[PDB]
Each structure stands twice: as C-alpha cells, then as structure tokens.
Write an enzyme that holds these catalytic residues in place. Sequence first.
Site, short mmCIF file in Angstrom:
data_model
loop_
_atom_site.label_atom_id
_atom_site.label_comp_id
_atom_site.label_asym_id
_atom_site.label_seq_id
_atom_site.Cartn_x
_atom_site.Cartn_y
_atom_site.Cartn_z
N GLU A 242 1.69 -1.58 9.28
CA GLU A 242 2.76 -0.70 8.82
C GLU A 242 4.19 -1.17 9.09
OE1 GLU A 242 1.89 1.35 6.69
OE2 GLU A 242 -0.20 0.91 7.15
N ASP B 216 0.84 -1.19 0.00
CA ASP B 216 0.00 0.00 0.00
C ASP B 216 0.88 1.25 0.00
OD1 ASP B 216 -2.35 -1.58 0.24
OD2 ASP B 216 -2.09 -1.65 2.42
MG LIG Z 1 -4.51 0.50 7.61
#
Ligand SMILES: [Mg+2]
Lengths: 331, 331, 331, 331
Positions: free
Chosen positions: C92, C62
């Site tokens: 992340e 992403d």
């Molecule tokens: Mg997210």
Amino acid sequence: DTNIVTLTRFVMEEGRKARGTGEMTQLLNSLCTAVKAISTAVRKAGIAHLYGIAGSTNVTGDQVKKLDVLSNDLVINVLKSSFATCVLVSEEDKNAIIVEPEKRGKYVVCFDPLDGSSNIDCLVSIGTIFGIYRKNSTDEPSEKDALQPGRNLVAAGYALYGSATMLVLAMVNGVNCFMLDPAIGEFILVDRDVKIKKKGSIYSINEGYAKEFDPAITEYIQRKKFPPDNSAPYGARYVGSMVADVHRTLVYGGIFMYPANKKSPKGKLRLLYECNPMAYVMEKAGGLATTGKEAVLDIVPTDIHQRAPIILGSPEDVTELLEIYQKHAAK
Amino acid sequence: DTNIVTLTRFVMEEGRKARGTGEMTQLLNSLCTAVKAISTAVRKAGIAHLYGIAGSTNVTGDQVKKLDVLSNDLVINVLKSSFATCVLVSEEDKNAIIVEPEKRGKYVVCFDPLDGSSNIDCLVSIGTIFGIYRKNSTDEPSEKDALQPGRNLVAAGYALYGSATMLVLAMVNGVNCFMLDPAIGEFILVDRDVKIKKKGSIYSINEGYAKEFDPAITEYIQRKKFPPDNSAPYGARYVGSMVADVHRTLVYGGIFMYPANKKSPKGKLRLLYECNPMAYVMEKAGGLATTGKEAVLDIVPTDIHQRAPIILGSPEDVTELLEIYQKHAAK
Amino acid sequence: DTNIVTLTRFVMEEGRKARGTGEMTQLLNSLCTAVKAISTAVRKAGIAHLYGIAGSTNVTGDQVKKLDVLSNDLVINVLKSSFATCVLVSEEDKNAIIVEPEKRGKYVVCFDPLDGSSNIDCLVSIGTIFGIYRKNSTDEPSEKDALQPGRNLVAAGYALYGSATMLVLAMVNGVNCFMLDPAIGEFILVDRDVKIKKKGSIYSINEGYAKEFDPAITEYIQRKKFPPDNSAPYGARYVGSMVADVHRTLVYGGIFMYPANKKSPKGKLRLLYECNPMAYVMEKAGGLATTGKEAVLDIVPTDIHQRAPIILGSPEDVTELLEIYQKHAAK
Amino acid sequence: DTNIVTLTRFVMEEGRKARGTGEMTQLLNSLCTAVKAISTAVRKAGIAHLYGIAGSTNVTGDQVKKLDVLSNDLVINVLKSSFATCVLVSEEDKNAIIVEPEKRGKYVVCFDPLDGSSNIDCLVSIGTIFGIYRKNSTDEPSEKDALQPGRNLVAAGYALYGSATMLVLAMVNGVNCFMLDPAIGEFILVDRDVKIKKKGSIYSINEGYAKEFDPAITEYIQRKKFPPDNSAPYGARYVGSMVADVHRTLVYGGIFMYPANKKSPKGKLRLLYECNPMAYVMEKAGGLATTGKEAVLDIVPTDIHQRAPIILGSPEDVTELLEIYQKHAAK
Ligand SMILES: [Mg+2]
Ligand SMILES: O=P(O)(O)OC[C@H]1O[C@](O)(CO)[C@@H](O)[C@@H]1O
Ligand SMILES: O=P(O)(O)OC[C@H]1O[C@](O)(CO)[C@@H](O)[C@@H]1O
Ligand SMILES: O=P(O)(O)OC[C@H]1O[C@](O)(CO)[C@@H](O)[C@@H]1O
Ligand SMILES: O=P(O)(O)OC[C@H]1O[C@](O)(CO)[C@@H](O)[C@@H]1O
Ligand SMILES: [Mg+2]
Ligand SMILES: [Mg+2]
Ligand SMILES: [Mg+2]
Ligand SMILES: [Mg+2]
Ligand SMILES: [Mg+2]
Ligand SMILES: [Mg+2]
Ligand SMILES: [Mg+2]
C-alpha cells in the site's frame, strides 16, 4: 455439548404447560439481546470511554452516567420491537413510556437499565433489574398500568455483570439462574430451582448511615456483632450494588438491608424497578422481603418512582429483624 | 483505532530508558497470557463447572477451590516459560518453587493466583495479585530470595476480574491501569499515572469482627460514623475481595482495613503476595499502607506465607488512623 | 489446558538456541497484535461497514479498499513500536518506510497488509503476508535494504483469515502453524514442522486466462485433465486469495500457479511481499517455488513493487511443470 | 448503536403482516443458536482438535468428519426443541427424523449440517444449508413430507463460515443477509433485499472433470475463455465449498456449475439440502437455477438423498448455457 439448554428453550418448555400467545418468550429473548449488548459495553467501557456522566439528572436526583443512557436505550428499543409490551417504566425516564399501537403487547415492564452507578468507575459488579406485569385493564395503556403491587408480578429478575454475566429469572413456580456464554452469546441454565437458605451468616447494609438508623436496625446490627448466645458473629458484606448484594444473599443466604432512616422515611431504593423485582425473586426462592412493617410485594404504588425501605433474604434472618421492629413499635 | 497502546508497548517504551535484558517485558507478557486465560474461565465458570472445592487445604488453611488450582497452574506455567524468573512464591504452594536452570531468569515473583475466594460462587469481583523482586544474591536460588521487604519490589500490581478485566501495574515511577480488550485479547492503557486522592469518604472493613477490634479501629470507625466536626459521615463499602476493595480505594480514594484483632495478632492477609503488592501500588500512587505501627513495605519477612495487618489508601485517612493508634500506644 | 503453547513461547524457546537480542520475538509479538486486530475487524466488517473502496490506487494499480488502509495502518504502527525494524515495504505504500532512529531495530519487513482483495466482499478467505530480512549493510537504512533475494529471508509466513484464523510461520529450520484462540487472543501451536506432500492431486490457477497462457501452462493443464497414463485427473481449486490457495497447497499438497502470460511477462503477484514469503514457506516445507525458469528466492529485486511469475507446491508437481517449460524452451 | 436490527426482529416484523402461530421465528431463532455454536467450534477447530474423520460413511458415501457429527447434533437438537418441526432430513442421517409428538411443529426442515467437507482442514470457507417446508398433509409425519419440490419452500438459506459468519435467508418476498456479531452473539442485517446481477464475469466449476463434461459444458467453458465477440474472458473462481461459491455468485454475480457428466447422470450435489435451498435463494434474488434441462425447484424428489445437476446464478449467464444445451439436445 450439543444440547445447550438456553433461557429461550427453558422458558418455552415451561410455558408449554399453559401455552399462551408466546410473547413472554419474545419479551425475554428481546431482553436477553439488550443484556448481552450491555454486558459487552461494560466489559470494555474504559476502552470505549463509556465512563463519566451524561450531563443530566433523573427524577430521583441521580447523576446520569453514559452507561445509564446506553443501557436505557438498548432496553427501551428491544422491548418495543418485541411486540410484547405496552407500558414501560424506567428509572431514567420521568414518565411511563407508552408503546405505539403497532408494536403493543400485553406486558408492562418496569426496569432499572443499570443498577449500581456508584460502582461503575471502580469496575465493581453492576446489573439490570426488571419486573414484568400483565396488563389487566381494558382502557388505553398508561402509567396507571405500572402501578400494581409486586404480588401481581408474572416475571422478575436481574442481569448481573460481575466476574461472569448471569441472568437470574423468577416466575410463578420458581427461580433459575442462566449464565451468559460469551462464545455463542447465549444464556445457559447453570442453576435450577434456586432456594435461599433459611438462615445465613452475613448481614449487608451501609453502616455509614449509623447516625440515622432507627433503634431497630441499630439493635439488629449490634446483635449480629455481639450475639447474645455467644454464637459466631455474622460476617459483613456490602458491595454497593443492589444486584450484587442481593445475588450473594440469594446464593449464600443471609440478609441485605436498605431501611428507612431519620432522613429517609421511605429508604432509598425504588419500589417499581428495584425493590419489587428483588422481593419477588427473593420470595419465589423461599425468602422474605419486608419494609420492616409490611411485605414489599403488598405495597400499592402511587408513584412509579416511589421509594421503599427493603430488608430481604433468609426467612429466619429477616424474621429476627421484624421481631425487633415489632418490639420497638410505638403508638 | 490503528495505534493500540498495549501494556507490552507501554512497558517496552518505559524500559527503553534504562534498557535492560528485556525479560521484565517477557515476564509481564507471560503474566498477561495467564490473566487472559483466567479471565475467560471465570467469565464462564458456571458453564464450565469451575465452581466448587478442589479437595485440599493450603498452608494458610483455606479450602482450595477449582479456580485456585487452574489459576495457579496457568500462572506457574507461563512464568516458567518466560525465561525471566527463578524463584516463585504462590499462596497455593507450601514452599517456594525453584525454576529449572534452563528457564531461569533474574526475577522472583510472589503471587496470589486467585484473590477473593469467598466471592467466587456469588460472581463478585475476584482477581490476581503479584509482586516482582529482582534476585540480588549470587548463590543458588531459594526461598530466602522471596524473603525481601516490599521496599525491594521492582514491579507489583493485580488483575481485577470485575465488570471489566483490568490489569493495574505499578513500577518505580508510577501506576498505570490497562483494560483487557476481549475482542483482540490485549490490555490497553486506559488510565495513566494514577494518583489516589489525599482524603476520601469511604471506609472499607469487615465490621463483623467488631467484637475483636482493638480500641484504635473501634474508635476510628465510630469517628467515620459520628464525625466530631459534624461533617458528612463516611460511606461504607466492603466487597469482600481485597483486589476489588483496594482498586476502588485507588480510584475513589478512602481507606481499606484488615487490621489485627484480639484473635489475629498479625491480621489475616498474606504479606508476600497480598499485602506487599497492594502497599506498593498504593505508595506509588501517593497513598499509604501501614500495619498500624509500621509501614508494610518495611517489614522483613521470615515466612513466605507470613500474615500482616494492613491499613491502606488516602494518606490523610490512613494518617488519621495512625494518630489514633499512637494515642492508644501502651507500654 | 494450563500449559498453552503460544507462538511467543514457541519462538522464544527455538531462539533460546542462538540467543540473540530478542527483537525477533518483539517483532512477531507486535505482528500478532496487528493480526488479531485485523481478524476482529474482518470478522465483523459488514457490521462495521468496513467494506468498500478507500478512494485511492496503489503503485500496482489496485483499487484500495477500506480494510487495506486499516490493516496497513495496524501493521505499520505495531512494527514501528516493536523497536525491531528499520525499513518497511508495504504493498500500500509507494516507497519504503524508514523507521525513525529511536524505534529502529535490525529487521526489514516486507508485507501485504491484506491479501485477496477481490474476495473481501464475498466473505471468502483473505490474509496477511510478511517477509523478514535482517539488515546487513552499515549505512543509513533505505529502500535498497528491502531489495534482497528471498534466499536472505530469516522469517516469513502469513495470517489466514478463513473459517479460522491461522498464523503460518517459517524460519530457518521449518514451518509451524498457530491458530488464533478467540477467547484469550493467543496463537496456539496446532501444527508442528509442516511438510508438504511430494505429489498432490489438485492444481490451482485462474483458467480464465487460458487465451494468454504460454504453451507450457496450456500443456500442463491439459495433462492434469487428460492424464496420459490414464490415472485419475487432478481436482481443480482456485479460491482467488493467494494466502488461501497456498495454504491449501501446503496442507493438501498439489500445485498453485500464477504464471506469466502473453500480456504479463512477469505474472501479477508481487515478489517482495507475496511471492517471496510464500516461496520461502514452501521451500522450508520441502516444496518448490519457481517462475518456470528460475527459483523465486534467487531473484535479485530491483523494484520493491516488482512482479514475479510463481508456480509452487509439491516438488514432483512443480518439477513436472518445469520439465514442460524446458521442453518448450526456445532460442 | 442502541437499535440493533437482528434477524429475530427482522423476521418478526415481516411476519407481522400475515401473523401466524409464530413458530417460524422459533424455528429460525433455534437455528441461529446452532449456527453460532458451529461458528465458534469451527473458529477454533484446530485448537479443539475437531479436525479428522468420525469413522463412518453417509448414505451418499462421504467420509464423515468430526464437525459433521457436531454440527449435525447441534442442528438436530435445536430444531427439536423449537416446537416448530415434525420431519427432519439431514445429509448425515440415512432416514428422515420424526420429531416426537410433544415437540412437533408444522415445519419440515432439510439441511446439510456442514457443507464443504474437503475444505475443512485447509481452513477454507464452509457452511450450513437449510430448506424449510410447511407440512401440508394431515396423516402422521414421515419421510414423504420431505419429498416436496423446491417450489414449495417457505424459507431457505445458508450459514457461511468465512472471513466472517453470515446467515443468508430467503423467503417468499426476497433475500436478506445477516452478519454474526461475535461480541453479542446476534445476526444483524447488513444486506437488505439482495438482487443478483443480470450478467456476471465469473464462471465457477471444477474443470478437473473436463474429461467427463458433456458437449454443452465443454462448449460453454471454451466460450468463457475465448469469447466469440472478442469481449473480456470471464474470470474463474472455484473455492470448493458450494456455500462459498454460491454466495460469491449472489453478491458478485456470474455462474456456478456442478453439472451431470459421463459418470454422474445426476451430478453430485444433493437436491433436498443442497440444490433446492440454493436454487430458492437464487430465484428469490432474481437469479436462475437449472439442471440444464429443467428448473431445479420443479423437480419432484423420490429420494431424500437424491442428487441433482445444478447450474445457477445470473439469469443471462444461466440462459446462455441453457441455449447451448438446447442446441445439443438430441433425440
Ligand atoms: Mg493486499
Ligand atoms: O451508597 P448507598 O447509599 O449505600 O447506596 C447503594 C445502593 O444504591 C444503589 O446504587 C441504587 O441503584 C443500589 O444499587 C445500592 O444497593
Ligand atoms: O471474609 P473476611 O474475613 O472479611 O476476609 C476477606 C478478605 O480475605 C480475602 O478473601 C483473602 O484473599 C481477601 O480477598 C478479602 O479482602
Ligand atoms: O483474479 P486473479 O487474476 O486470478 O488474481 C487473484 C490473485 O490476486 C491476488 O488477489 C492479489 O493479492 C491474490 O491474492 C490472488 O491469488
Ligand atoms: O470436489 P468437487 O467434486 O469439486 O466437489 C465440491 C462440491 O462438493 C461439496 O463439497 C459437497 O458438499 C460442495 O460443497 C462443493 O461445491
Ligand atoms: Mg440504575
Ligand atoms: Mg439501581
Ligand atoms: Mg487466593
Ligand atoms: Mg487473596
Ligand atoms: Mg495479495
Ligand atoms: Mg455436508
Ligand atoms: Mg454440502
């Protein structure tokens, strides 16, 4: 709760009478934005590291704080964009500010961006004081336009950043208090047509200056402590921020004093953006405001940073003091 | 700005040393919720019509205000649900509150739900004062458990609802100030290990009681106005709310006084939830707190609503006053 | 309004039953602080210029946004200081985060710091998803500790930053919704023991992937549009943020689908911090959550960033879909 | 951060060009107050128990919610006190509202106090939609004054209560987005002169109505899923609140559709306070808005609660759809 009476709605309706250009409302709305910004910063100054000095001194010799700068900028900026002012007098600026032609309006605003500097760090109540004058002359706007006696004020008031943020506003017909609603960012009418009590039971002054007080103040204070008629002695209160002490005087009644003394012939507080606005609010509330020899609003200024002695509050308390000054009046 | 040092994180880490049951953190977290609720109500009291009396009088004879009730309820409720307390002493309650068995913890909390009632209406700074005692006895919890001298305090502090909301907390090793961040509803560390100046230049007392002051206070005040060594006279400050005056004393240094007088042998302020918490904070900050004859924290209470004379602040200022009392000490 | 039932009070009372070390409460309180910080930033992202990419890509490919970083940091930091976790899995972060020994607790937390990235810029609802696992093993904490099937979840839920900020929490005995009170920064119980309807009338899926759908999804969708019994066709809804679509499914009932397709054998949503938490909430609410071939909570992960097909919501709607998959099941 | 560019300052400067009576600014300022009040209530509706029906039905047959009433009242009240309007058309009111003579201004405002009712309970994005018309006629104000085609709009926009509260405003020269700053209660310019992309990759419609779609919509949707040129299929998005779906279309580009169908010759959305305002914003942003047979802004209304089919967004996407309708156009 669907009919919120805001300061804007209030001003617009009152002004609906005369019906003018409508820039006074623009003026106040602009001022309200600055006050909300100041209120938010002050509410979290410690966290935002807004405490401390800015590394400069003003014309009156104060040690400029960071909030002085911030508040001053916010007020300068919003007043300029209001298209309602032309001359601006700030405690933080050496000379009057002249609004560029394009954004010029017919009002002159004198203001103290942040009052009560000694109380910033200790989280004690502080505020903002303003006085609005309509430009009368016809020639280019300049400092002279801010040199009008307080009697010429069209609007005056102050923002009080205390346990709650309040915007006290006085105009030709009276005084009204508006409280800031933190949730929607609006000042709402909480007190209508405020009138000060004819006589109070609280005296407010910095007795640390006792060694410099003139015989009049000395005698007055002794009288508040040892009443000759054996009545209850007055209670004492001195927050240290004019806006706080004056506001309390307005709602509880009594007297606030920052007189002249052996070392300060003209007291300390500034006439343009401190003394006049409060004298005006006080008088529109049925109160009095004197230097001890003359009404504060009748002084014709010669310096925008001029100082003035001020004694204000309940008419009977102020009058008792004037009588004493008159009793001591010398050749 | 992604590593916010909150009061919770702070307490947990300090307590990570001894490592206890962890209910002190529950206690404080619960208290912080009540303080935020009080802060929000006070910030908009006028708009919420929270001003005015509640139509009742407390054991100490004060005229109960609406905010007294609200704040008292909020604090009572959160302290009960914390599972950390067993006995509660509130200025607003005639007798000690005994926590039901199921929600009982080992702490005794004495508190002033809302300090500075005379300053509610004028938007002057007000606050909340608390003192935490660990229950020592083994028998059923009762009022006696709150009758411990201030030396037994494990934690004390106060919430200050001023231009900003601050939570000052003192424990065995020191004092720390946490400021309420309105945006996320958290108290963040802004001042670490606060220490009061050894000597100040501000004296704080209600001089309206001059006619009742004992020769010691009278002489001390005269000395602050007319220094014998021709040094600069002390500045005067008296907000009217103990929490405000004490906080200023803590950060600016100086002295705050609410002594006994001809009509009040034991002064006015309450020992359990007013005098002790402040004396404790003051001492953990390197300051002093005396009645004028004995340390405030060493008094063994006999009444949870007992009053006590209190003089506190910078050690040198307080000591100068003690010397005067000793000079006047009679048979 | 003086007895505010917060998430903290709620958790503490429920946990008062078993009565553990009390770190779950520390865990949640810490998480609530992060969620309030995220809520405040998101509420004013545009003004704070928090929109845009961070100039990086995650393990799942992403395009990392600025709020991804901020939210991730806030959550990492508060979870570490809670003294309740030891292993952390974030969308992340490439690898599991191992909490330093001193701040280690017995919980493993998998989370999606900010869900619904495509909807950040258009101000559409976004949120935070978390799953709490108790560390069972005895050896040094590591990634393996986060590789437990959803059945092992002890607590799961999500923060929804929509028209209002809500914290939905599910534990062994059920689901409860808490709404963030902006004024005092507290999550208050607004919905107790939430149960999803047995059958809904809303289907939620991205039909833009029609060309890739397997015959099962294709048939199911056609059935929701052209019911064979001539009943009212289902309404369609697809916000684009899992947290929003799932929450609606929880309160309105119906079905949410992010199935596998010709190009994505394992769908798109992540199992550890997206699929499992929602499957858990869904099941504790009396709902179902399947991949279309097996219960989501029964999958034993082999990769912390593993993807999984997920179909969840009302039991009857999910079952109707499973029957179709079973009808198409091939050799 | 001392030069905050608010919606008020923005409007005043733009309007400084023509320089009118200045009531448009009064109009918008009044509207901004209502929007902040709605935003605050919605942010804590669950806690304030603002969810649920009001026990009534509107002219369009919707089940009136409590927030419908609240929002409607807030908007009605502030618009009246603005001294800028004379006729008001609300989704919640059967007939046009005629402003009393004393508070009359020259504007006609059509509005949807709260858009997206089905998404209230699930915390999905909702908003407020408005359209401002200048009264042209000279006779007594009445309903007829609100029956002007969208081409006559002077100002239109909407408030979006999503992850953040935004006020999108379009006027003769363009579109600007202002974000609500929760701390000071002001809308600040975050997006200047917004222009929609010529072509997007997202289609937005409720496919649950597939059985009723006309051959044109059916073919268009099939084309977005199975592109004939083998280009990437469009992504699908349908939040359920027009304000949310349209806003996304404005910032991400693409197409939003609420066409007519076998049972709804005139679609569902209302022309006066839903279709026109969005068509106007869309066109001032360089986008298109058609019924599929004619421009939405060119329809001359005959009923203030009239419904209209609406297809809007990127010009190329809308045009591709018009071409299909033209391909199917029958005798
Ligand atoms: Mg997210
Ligand atoms: O410390 P002093 O001399 O009493 O001065 C306090 C006065 O000075 C000011 O701080 C000047 O702004 C006033 O707000 C306040 O009334
Ligand atoms: O009006 P007085 O007698 O000076 O009393 C003020 C004192 O009383 C209190 O209001 C009692 O709570 C204190 O907060 C304050 O210091
Ligand atoms: O754009 P798509 O493929 O429909 O994906 C949307 C899904 O992806 C996510 O954004 C991933 O976090 C989910 O929140 C959401 O349900
Ligand atoms: O549920 P449906 O038929 O898709 O209708 C949704 C539409 O109706 C409305 O709720 C009407 O206000 C719009 O906000 C939204 O676009
Ligand atoms: Mg100043
Ligand atoms: Mg000043
Ligand atoms: Mg009290
Ligand atoms: Mg008190
Ligand atoms: Mg996600
Ligand atoms: Mg509506
Ligand atoms: Mg609508």
